[PDB]
Amino acid sequence: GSSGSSGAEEPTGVFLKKPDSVSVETGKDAVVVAKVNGKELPDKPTIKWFKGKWLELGSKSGARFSFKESHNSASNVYTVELHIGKVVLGDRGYYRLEVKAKDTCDSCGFNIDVEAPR
């Protein structure tokens, strides 16, 4: 078939990809996608997922909260994705991704929504 096209100047930021707000439904599984330009960073960045207040996600390696981080050899980009299972209205709201390096420091903010049943 046929398709369109696009074009723009590379982003002047370390966060090659920002976690766009994802609207999920209660009882469903949420998933966020984000990337980080390591090259631009002096040292290995620190990926940490926070929830509204000064909370702390990913307590143990065996909870609904899953984390997928992959590092490319040629690309050199860290692709992190936050997956949440059995989402509830108590989870919906806003989040914040902290990322600090040797000297470089940057953080992005996303918002999730949990649609309730009829």
Q: What angle do CA 44, 77, 33 make, to 5 degrees?
A: 105
CB 87 within 8 A of CB 28: yes
Q: Say if residues 22 and 112 touch (Cβ distance below 8 Å).
A: yes
Q: Domain limits at 8?
A: 1-118
Q: Enumerate residues 6+ apart whose C-beta is below 8 A from 111.
A: 21, 93, 94, 95
Q: Find the CATH number of the domain harbouring 104.
A: 2.60.40.10
Rg of the chain over all Cα atoms, to the nearest angstrom? 16
Asked if residue 112 lies in contact with residue 19, where contact means CB atoms within 8 angstroms, the answer is no
**Solving technique:** NMR
**Quick one: three-class SS letters along the chain?**
CCCCCCCCCCCCCCCCECCCCCEEECCCCEECCEEEECCCCCCCCCCEEEECCCCCCCCCCCCCCEEEEEECCCCCEEEEEEEECCCCCCCCCCEEEEEECCCCEEEEEECCEEECCC
Distance CA 118, CA 25 (A): 11
Q: Which residues, including other chains, have CB under 8 Å from residue 53's CB and lie 6 or more apart?
A: none
Please tell me the distance from the alpha carbon of residue 111 to that of residue 108, in angstroms, as a whole number.
Answer: 11
> Is 36 within 8 Å of 45 (Cβ atoms)?
yes
How many CA atoms are closer than 13 Å to the CA of 33, on its beta-carbon side? 1
* 26-61 b/e (C-beta count within 10 Å ≥ 16 → b): eeeebebebbbbbebbeeebebebbeeeeeeeeeee
The Cα–Cα gap between 29 and 108 comes to: 22
In our burial notation (b when 16+ CB lie closer than 10 A, e otherwise), range 4-21 reads: eeeeeeeeeebbbebbee
Task: Please give the tally of structural domains in the chain.
Answer: 1
Contact 113, 23 (CB under 8 A): yes
Report whether 50 contacts 98 (CB < 8 A): yes
